[PDB]
């Protein structure tokens, strides 16, 4: 498939949202990422 510049931006953001809640936030909140998306098990939009 041939992706456009926009599409590429979106996939990129999606990848970034795919990170984990940083360790420090755990400590700062005295205590999960519900938007975790696997490439195979999940499906993005467009």
């Amino acid at each position: 498939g041939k992706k456009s510049k926009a599409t590429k931006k979106r996939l990129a953001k999606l990848d970034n949202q795919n990170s984990r809640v940083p360790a420090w936030v755990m400590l700062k909140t005295d205590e999960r990422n519900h938007k975790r998306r696997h490439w195979r098990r999940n499906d993005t939009d467009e």
Binding site: K5, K8, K9, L11, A12, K13, D15, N16
Partner: protein, 81 residues
């Protein structure tokens, strides 16, 4: 108004280009052309841009591989920041 140069892209590969090819890599505003990147670069570091290669990254940002003239030395230009 948006600025052309965002910051220096410093990674192992960026180093190799700098030490062996006299190139500097930067994170630039994706609306910027090679031409603009070239100018912005010369005016900020006072050097002579020979060539610019761009790539829209999977990081949402635009990367520019800027090669300086033999007259200038990437290693040094980068050492002052």
């Amino acid at each position: 108004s948006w600025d052309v140069i965002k910051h220096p892209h410093v990674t192992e590969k960026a180093m190799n280009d700098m030490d062996f090819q006299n190139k500097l890599q930067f994170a630039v505003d994706d609306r910027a052309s090679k031409g603009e990147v070239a100018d912005a670069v010369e005016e900020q570091y006072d050097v002579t841009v020979e060539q610019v290669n761009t790539q829209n990254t999977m990081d949402g940002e635009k990367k520019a591989v800027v090669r300086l003239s033999e007259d200038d030395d990437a290693q040094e230009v980068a050492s002052r920041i």
